[PDB]
Structures are given as structure tokens and as C-alpha cells.
Design a protein around this ligand. Sequence first.
Ligand SMILES: [Mg+2]
Ligand SMILES: [Zn+2]
Lengths: 101, 62, 136, 213
Amino acid sequence: TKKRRNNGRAKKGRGHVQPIRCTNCARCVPKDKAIKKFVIRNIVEAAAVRDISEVSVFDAYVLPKLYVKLHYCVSCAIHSKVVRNRSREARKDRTPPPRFR
Amino acid sequence: QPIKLARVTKVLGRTGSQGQCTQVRVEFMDDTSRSIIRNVKGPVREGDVLTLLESEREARRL
Amino acid sequence: SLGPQVAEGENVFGVCHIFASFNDTFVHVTDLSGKETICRVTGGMKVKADRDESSPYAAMLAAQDVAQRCKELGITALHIKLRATGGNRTKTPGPGAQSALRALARSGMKIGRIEDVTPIPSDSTRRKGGRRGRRL
Amino acid sequence: VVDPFSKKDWYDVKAPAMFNIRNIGKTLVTRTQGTKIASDGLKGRVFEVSLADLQNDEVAFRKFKLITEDVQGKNCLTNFHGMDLTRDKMCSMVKKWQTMIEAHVDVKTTDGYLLRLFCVGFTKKRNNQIRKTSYAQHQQVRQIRKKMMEIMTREVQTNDLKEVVNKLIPDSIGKDIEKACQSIYPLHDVFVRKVKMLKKPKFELGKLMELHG
RNA sequence: AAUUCUUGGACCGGCGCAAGACGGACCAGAGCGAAAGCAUUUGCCAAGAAUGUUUUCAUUAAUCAAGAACGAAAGUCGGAGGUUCGAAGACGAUCAGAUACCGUCGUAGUUCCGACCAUAAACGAUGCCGACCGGCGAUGCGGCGGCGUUAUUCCCAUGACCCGCCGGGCAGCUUCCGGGAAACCAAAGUCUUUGGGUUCCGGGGGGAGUAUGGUUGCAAAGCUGAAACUUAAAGGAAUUGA
RNA sequence: AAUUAUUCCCCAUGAACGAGGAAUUCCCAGUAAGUGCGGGUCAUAAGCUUGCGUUGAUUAAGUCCCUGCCCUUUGUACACA
Ligand SMILES: [Mg+2]
Ligand SMILES: [Zn+2]
């Protein structure tokens, strides 16, 4: 039976969308179907901050961030717990979950 | 490196695998301002004191 | 093994090309031109267990080792050029990068400017593994 | 069975007069004992120095390529070879809901340095804008790309490399394109993304020795 | 972990050189196309929807057996090319066994030009043309009207925003329009109150898209396509358990 | 009726055992544990069990890490599940 009105993807008026490789696997999935995440981390972690803060020659150097755009297949996205199964009615809510702090 | 005295201001909650730490924000007795979160073993009250072997490394607010 | 720079407060910068893959960690100090190698201590040179060459442990060991080998030759500070596998493969620095970068800054070497040099393609060849990927 | 850092003498590196702080840093070579010579091996090496390290305290997102054209005596005399933005800056600029306009030109200085200049601009979201996207139509993009090319060429072609690098130390070119393309579609993050050196002139000595003060 | 590579200096780092693939991030429930499909720049060539119109012709139209153009991927023949990846195959592991999953190689192929083949879950699993029947907010293109903001500072006037209106398009949200076995659908509605026009096509499950004849193709195979015999269910949506 | 010693007494005999590997049981206050005393069985009759006092702590006011069990969402061609 039909589960999702849009067939689990953001294709409406095309017919073909170039496929993309899952980052975890190397599975070819359509670009619009793939679960995309944008990861912005500092090059050093949290506790190493104060070590490299004071063992650096430059006073007030804002060390850079690494910017990674991750694509997953639905299999990897559910396994790595990026997305999960939802209530039959709660599946519909498209609003991205709250990030405050 | 000097051992520093700090007064536990408040208890937040308990952490560890089997709930065997107390997450508490501990204010330094020497300087009036500096408050850092540390994990505490044993039964801890609110309004007691700790002897820190290092005054810098801080616990993660879980 | 004789730097003519007076050790007043003049910092002699090397450049360490930290290549943290998911099955090895390279800690490699180079001269400022990028040509002449000073010291190269790989991850699997320290530990002889093939599984955990790309560990925070072996990365920390090799980082302390190069830091001692580097202050012998008289390089004071270092510039960081961190990179992942890149190309077709994953673009995240492996689990060794953090222990390597931390440990050789803990070991008395000063950090200049940190940057990323992961070889990213404008667009690449076909990736290893099938169309269905790595089923496991 | 030898100490490979017994026979390695160090050097000083001078940056050209255009930048403030001159002594870049240290170098090493196996000093001559036959056919392969110290100078012969020392020439052709390229350095990538941050503009913050070349000036006193400055832009950390811009880097400059300098090659050892010749060595005088215990001293490498570098010359401008290229320029590029940093990975973190280039990644931080490129974000969703805007058109990213890119243009490249192949231009020649009066002295025989041929350069290839890569410019990049992003369409700017307005102050009272309720719309989320703020894209530019394809003719608007083509016109902005036309203004990018014609400004990047008129700026470089007419004067010598010393004055061109003096323009690249600010971003006087990036400002000029950001001013010209106000009427077509207002931009914000207009930088000369990259510079590549393709063909260089016949290596004279008096040219570089007056570029080095 | 092993097969592989490496003191005839691998892997890592620098400067160049060539090769053949591929156009990241911008990239969207955005656009265009009859569908397949289509993404770096610039130039040339012909095409096209929508809008605008107090232009023109005056029923020239809708759908269609016969016939015809295009048709992903794989595949076949001929020439050029061979970077990556990789049916076959060569091993290395795991396993009770592995002829697989996992790993190192790897021919055909993948790429380009010219001939074929004509099929896909070729999907909106939903023919096309026309009319009528709720509301709301956005969006892409064209037009139209209006405080104000910003650039051309000289701002006439164009561009970037802002607020609304009109027409075509991709979609969305919502409701006792109404329908439906329901899931759900402003179409899958206006259906026992049954009739706007027309093409294709289904008749319990198997046997079987098989046999046979015909036709197309070099081959693979494509299109058309039964019977004997067997069988009381197979199946669709939704519910409560495990 | 005590041989294959029922129970009890006396002299004699003087064993492994120096605190116990893999693992693993029970328990938070008059509780654990030590310590003895009655009931049941009973002609003979406690190393068991079932009750009673006596002396009287260490640690904790927590968690889902391990082991179990119960929910909610979800998928199902299973309903002797
Ligand atoms: Mg399709
Ligand atoms: Zn995957």
C-alpha cells in the first residue's frame, strides 16, 4: 500500500535526478532521496582547546572549522540513528527538530 | 602545582554507568568568581567543599 | 642538527602534514618550503598490532616521538596541515588526528596556523564498491 | 650508516618589498660536494605564507605562493608565484539560498607575467526581504560574470606585477566588482578567489633586486 | 587477518608532465523537455511554452485501426581509446559447507564515432480533450498597479526588496464539496438522481506469457499467443494479538 | 532386635585445612552476621526446617551499565501465533 504521498523523495516535476554515493557505503541513491547532513566541527575537540589555546604562538587566533556535507542512503541513515521510524500521523511533520544548545 | 579549595554551590544530577557520580557546579574559595562543573564520587551535600588536584579541567554538562 | 637562529625569542616554524586515515595515522614534520623532510613517524611504526595503527594511542606515541626528534634538530614551533583520505573516499579526519595534534602541542612544540588540505574533487572518477555499496 | 642531518646547512628567506615583514623563515640543503649544487637544488622551491604572517597581524584566510628565483648568499630571494583563499573561508562563504557567480580571465602584465585570475561573488539577501531564496536570473548572472571578466582584465593588463600584487594585498579588485554589480544584483562576498602563474618572462636579476628594495 | 606492494627505496612530502573519465559544495518537494532525459565558460545554429495584443485566417478542431519519429540500462557487429570502476575469472579470509556477503587483482564492458536491439517498478503503479463544484498561504515565468527602502547621486529611467491583482506551470496545507471496501483522492468528485467526445484494455487462481504458427533481428531476443490438465480459494484495505 | 558402628559417655588415635581458580548467592536498620533456646519429625532424635530472644555493624537514598520483566511507536505473507 502507498505509505508516503511523495514517494520518500523530493522529485515532483523531473523523471530523472543524477544518483549520489552514500558516504558510509558507496551505494548509488538518487540525490533528492539521500538524507543530507551539514557538519561544522572545530579541527580540535573540546578539552584539547585549552592545551592548543596556550601552546600557540598567536594571541587571539580563532582556529578554523572543518565543513563536511554528508549524504547517507536510507539504510545507513536509520542504522547510524540520524533518522528513525515515527508514528503513522507524526511521519507527516516536516519541521526539522529543535537545535537551541 | 597547588591543590585548590572549592565550595560546591549546587547539585545538578547523577551520571556514570551505574549512577555513581554527582554532577555539581563548584565555586573556588580563593577567587569569588570562578565556577566550573565537576563529577563528584561519594555522598556529596550542597554547601560542602572539595580539594582539587587540578583547578582547570572541567566536567561535561550532560 | 645546528640552527643558526639565536634562541632569544625567534620561533623556527616547521610544517607537520598530519594525514589521519581510518586504518593509519602519519605525523610528518617538513621544512617551510614543503620539500625537505625533517622527521616522519607513522602510526604503525610505534605499535606492532595491525588493527590499532590508526588509534588515538599510537597517534599520541608517534606525536611525542616526532616532537622529541624535532626539538633535537632545533625546530621550535609548527604549522598544522591536517587532511583526511579525500578524493572519492571519506573527507573526515580519522580517529588519530586529535590525539596527534594535542600530544605534539603538549610535548613543548608551539602551534602556528591550523588549516585543512583534504584533496576534494570538483568531480571525480567512479568510487570503489558496487552500485549497492558495501553490504555487511 | 650516516647522520643525514650532519651535512644540512640552514638559510634565511626574504619576501619581496611589497609585504612588511621580510624574513619568512628557515630552510635546509646538503651543501655542494660535486655535480648537484646547493643553489641548483635550492632554486624552484615554493612557500605558502599567510598574509597575517607576511604583514604584522592581518587576514588569516588569504595565502601567497613565493618561489626562490635565486639565492645570493645565506639568503633566498623569493618572488610572487600565486595566491589562493583557505578551505575554511571558501567552505564558510558557500551556503544555501543564493546564486554563486564564478568567473576566470587569462590576462598579461607589461613585464612578461601571464596570470589567470578566479573571482567568486554571492547574491546578497536584502534588509526588509521576507522571501527566503534571493536568486539571480541567468542573464543577470551572465552580465555580472561579464563585469567580473572586464574589470579583472582592465585592472591587471595596464600595469606591472609589483602594482598588481599591491592591489591583491587589500582586495581593491573585489571591491570594484562589488560596486559595478550593485545595479544588476547586489553582491556581498566578492573575493579574487585564486591567482595562477601560467607563463613567466626571461629571468633577469636587476628586476628582482629592485623588487627586493 | 590474510593475498598485494616495498632498502632494483613502497607509503608520506615538494616541483613539474601526460592521459582519459567526471562537473562537488551553490542544488531547492526549483526549472525545461513528447517521454527517455538534461548542470563549468564562451561563441554559433535552428526550435519552444507562457504572457501581451482593439494584428491576421474563419471552423481550419478532439481522439485515433494502418503507418511513422524518439526510446534509460544492459546487450551485438566495425573503427578509435583505454584514467577510474568492474560481469566473467585468479586467489585470501570467514563458515559445518561459500561456488556468496568481506578483501587484493582483473578480461569483456564503462568513454567517443557509425550501424543494430525496442525493453524497465519506461511509476502519478493513475490515457487524452472540454465544462462545473470550497478556503488559505507560498513558489517559478509573463503582465499590471501601489506607500516606502537601496544603485545609477541628476535621478527622468531602468535593476535589488516591499504590498496586492490577473493568467499559464511544479507542488503544499486545510474541511462533513462529494466519493470510496478502505488507505485515501479538489479529483480517484458532479454515478441506481446511472448518457460531453474518443483510443487502449480486464473477467477466479494456476498451467503460461509456456507450446505452436507468423513476423522482425547477425545473435540475444522482441511483438502476436492458446489448449489439455489441476484447483476453492488466490487476493485488496483496515482491525486486534503474537 | 543396633552387626552395616541408632543415641550418649571415657581414655585412645591427631588426618587435609595458612582464607579457597573459573564463577557465583543473599542483603540496606534492631536489618547482615555471630550466638545460643523451643516447636515439627520423635519409642531412640538435629549438622534440617520452623519460630524466639541476645550482641549489633560496614556501605546507599542512586542508576538503567549487566540480568530480567512491562509499556509506547514500528514492520509482518505469522494467528495450533
Ligand atoms: Mg524514470
Ligand atoms: Zn549506505
